[PDB]
Amino acid sequence: SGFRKMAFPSGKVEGCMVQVTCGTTTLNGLWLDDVVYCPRHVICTSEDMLNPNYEDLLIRKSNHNFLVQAGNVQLRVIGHSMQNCVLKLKVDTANPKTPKYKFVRIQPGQTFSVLACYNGSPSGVYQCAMRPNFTIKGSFLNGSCGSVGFNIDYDCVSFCYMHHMELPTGVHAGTDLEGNFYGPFVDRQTAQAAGTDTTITVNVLAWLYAAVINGDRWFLNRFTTTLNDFNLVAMKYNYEPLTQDHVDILGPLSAQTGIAVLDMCASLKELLQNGMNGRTILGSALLEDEFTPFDVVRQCSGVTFQ
Amino acid sequence: SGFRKMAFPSGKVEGCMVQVTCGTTTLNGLWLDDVVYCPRHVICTSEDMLNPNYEDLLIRKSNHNFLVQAGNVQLRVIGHSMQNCVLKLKVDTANPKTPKYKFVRIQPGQTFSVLACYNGSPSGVYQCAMRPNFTIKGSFLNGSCGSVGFNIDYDCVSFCYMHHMELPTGVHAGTDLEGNFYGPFVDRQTAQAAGTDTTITVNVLAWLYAAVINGDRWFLNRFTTTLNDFNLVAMKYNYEPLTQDHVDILGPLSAQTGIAVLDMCASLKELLQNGMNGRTILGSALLEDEFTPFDVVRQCSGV
Ligand SMILES: *[C@](O)(C(N)=O)[C@H](C[C@@H]1CCNC1=O)NC(=O)[C@H](CC1CC1)n1ccnc(NC(=O)OC(C)(C)C)c1=O
Ligand SMILES: *[C@](O)(C(N)=O)[C@H](C[C@@H]1CCNC1=O)NC(=O)[C@H](CC1CC1)n1ccnc(NC(=O)OC(C)(C)C)c1=O
Q1: So where's the catalytic machinery, residue-wise (chain A)?
Q2: Residues of B in contact with A7 (CB under 8 A)
Q3: Residue A135 CA to chain centroid, in angstroms?
Q4: Which of A268, B1, B94, B249 is the least buried, fewest Cβ under 10 Å from its Cβ?
C-alpha cells in the first residue's frame, strides 16, 4: 500500500566511493577491484576548462599527482589511463567491498538511482530517469562530479552513469562508465544546451497502472483507441511515440489489473485533451513519467536485493 | 543545483537488517550489538491478532521458536523480552556492522528515510514526513513490518521509526524503537483510522525557498503580509499556524535568498488563493510540505 518514488538501497555503492584529488581539484571516484574511475576533468585547472586538451594534460601527470583517499587511508596509484571522458587509476589495493558489478549503457526512459557524494563521502540517494533529451533532472552541487547512477539486480550492481556537468535550466549530464556521454555534450566549459525534452509515454502508462493497483481509478473511461489514434493526440502534447514494443512491455501490468493497454491509452488520451481538472493521481497533480513498467512491478510486488 | 526528494544513504542500516520468523510469520528485525528489535506481533497467529495477550503469548514462546537469519547465517536466540510494542531478541552474536546509533522520538513535521525490507533484505529507500496526524505516507507491502526509519548525522544513525501497520487511505503507522506508537494506534487487528491531517506550513515555506535558490522565482511578489494576516488566510486552507519560532527557523533560508519570511508568506497566500495557473514549482503542480528547513539547507549546501 502507498506508492513512492523509491531508490535502490545504496550500501553496495557507498563502499566503492573514494575521493580523488589532482593538484587543486577534488571530486569523487568509483573504486572497483584495483581500479578507480573518475571524470577526466579532475586533471584540469579552471584556466584549462574553457577548452582543455586532456590527452596533453594527462601526459604531463604522473601516478603520484593523484591522491586517492578511501576514508582516511590513502590508496597508492600505480598506473593511469584515459578512456573517452573517464580516467582510470590503477591502485595497489583491491577494494574489499567490491560488489558483483557490470557497466551498462542505458536508454532514454530508463531509470536509476544516484548516490550523491562530496569529497568521497555519500550524502544522499534519489531516483532519476534518463530523459529523451539525454539529460537527467538531478540534484548536484560543486564537488558531486564522479557520483554515479546504478541499478541493482539481485546481488549485481549495474553502473550506468557518472556525473560530469550542469547545463542550462539546472539539468545534468554525464557519461556511462566507459566515459561516453549520454547526448551530444562535451566535457568542456562552453555554451551547450539540451534539446527540447518530451514526456516518456510508456512510463506515464506504467504509473497509471500503479495508480489503479493502488485504488485510484477515476480517470478510467469507457473507450479504447488504436495505437495510431493515440499517437496523433500524444504527439500534440510533446509525448514520445508509443511503440508496439512499449505496448508489449506493458502486457504484465495490463493482465494484473484487467485493463487492456489500449484502454489505458484511451484514458491517457482524454487526460491530455481535457486535463485533470484539479484532480490528483497517486497524490500528484501532473502525470508522472519517471517510473518504468519494471519500477512499478518491482514496487507493487516487493522485489528485494542481497 | 536541482532539488530532489532525497533519502540518506542506507548502507549503515542495511548492515543491521535481519529476517525474523516465528511460526508462520516472517518479518524484519534490526540487529544492533547482540539484540534484535522487531514488532511484537511476530509472535501472533492470525487468530491471536483479534485481542492478543502479548505478555501471555510470549511466556509460551521458546527462544527456539524465533528463527533469525542474517544473510546465510542463523543467529541463535538466547533471550527474549518485550518493551511496549517491540520485541527484543538477545542473540549469541553481536552484530559486527553495528553503527554508532541512538533511538530518537521524532516530532510531527520532521522527516526521515525509510529502508523498506522484505525477508530481512533491503528493497528500497525513500523519504517520509511524520504527519501532524501521526501517520506517514509510505510504501509498504506484507512482509515490510520491522522496516525502520532513520536520520544520519555525520556517522551516527538516529533510529526513529519501526513499521507495524497500514490504515485506510493507504497510509502507515508504527512505533519508535522503544515500541511506543506514534499517534493513538494499537497493534491488533481492529478497525482503525487516521484523524484529519493538516499541512506543515513551515515546510511549504522551506520548499518555496528551495525553489528560489534553484532559480524558480516566478511566484515571488513585491507584497508582504503580517504574521496574523497570513495565519487568517492559511488556516482556512487547513495549514498549521505559523509561529514566531517557525519564522526564526526559516531565518537561514530567508537570509540566503534575501526574501523576508513575511514577504515569502505573501507568495504563499496568493498561491493558496489563486493556485498556480498552469505553472509548476520545482516541477510540482501542488505545494509540497514534506521538506523541512533543515532538508532544504542540507541539500542546497551539500553536507
Ligand atoms: C564537477 O566538476 C564537480 N567538481 O563537482 C562539476 C559539477 C557541477 C557543479 C555545479 N553542478 C554540477 O553538476 N562539473 C562542472 O563544474 C563542469 C566541468 C566541465 C568539464 C565538464 N562545468 C564547468 C563549467 N560550467 C558548467 N556548467 C555551466 O556553465 O552551467 C550553466 C550552463 C547552467 C551556466 C559545468 O558543469
Ligand atoms: C506487517 O505485520 C507485516 N508482516 O509486514 C503488516 C504490514 C502491512 C501489510 C500490508 N502493508 C502493510 O503496511 N502489518 C499488518 O498486517 C498489521 C498488523 C497489526 C498488528 C498491527 N495489520 C493487521 C490487520 N489489519 C491491518 N490493516 C488493514 O487491514 O488496513 C486496511 C483496512 C487498509 C486494509 C494491518 O496493518
Answers
A1: 41, 145
A2: 7, 124-126
A3: 9
A4: B94
Ligand nearest to the CA of B48: 2
Q: Which residues of B touch A166 (CB under 8 A)?
A: 1-2
Residues A192, A119 share a domain? yes
- A210 CB under 6 A from ligand 1? no
**What is the chain B residue with the closest CA to A210?**
B139
Helices marked H in B140-288: 201-213, 227-234, 244-249, 251-257, 261-274
Residue A187 and residue A211 in one domain: no
Ligand 1 within 6 A of CB of A173: no
Whether A40 lines ligand 1, by a CB cut-off of 6 Å, is no
Based on the domain organization, do A139 and A3 belong to the same domain?
yes
The CA distances from residue B204 to A190, A240, B268, B292, in Å, are 36, 33, 8, 8
Nearest ligand 2 atom, CA B49: 20
Domain ranges, residue A290: 198-301
Cα–Cα separations (whole angstroms), residue B257 to A32, A230, B264? 41, 45, 10
HEC-encoded secondary structure of B59-97: HCCCHHHEEEEECCEEECEEEEEEECCEEEEEECCCCCC
Q: How many domains does chain B have?
A: 3
Distance of alpha carbon B181 from alpha carbon B179, whole angstroms: 6
The answer to whether B19 touches B26, Cβ cutoff 8 Å, is yes
Q: What's the CATH number where A191 sits?
A: 2.40.10.10
Task: For residue B302, give the nearest of A15, A143, A304 by CB distance.
Answer: A143
Pairing of strands A100-103, A156-167: parallel
Query: Which residues approach ligand 2 with their CB closer than 6 A?
Result: A 1; B 27, 41, 140-145, 164-168, 172, 187-189
d(CA A229, CA A103): 39
Q: How was this structure obtained?
A: X-ray
Which of B197, B229, B248 terminates a domain? The answer is: B197
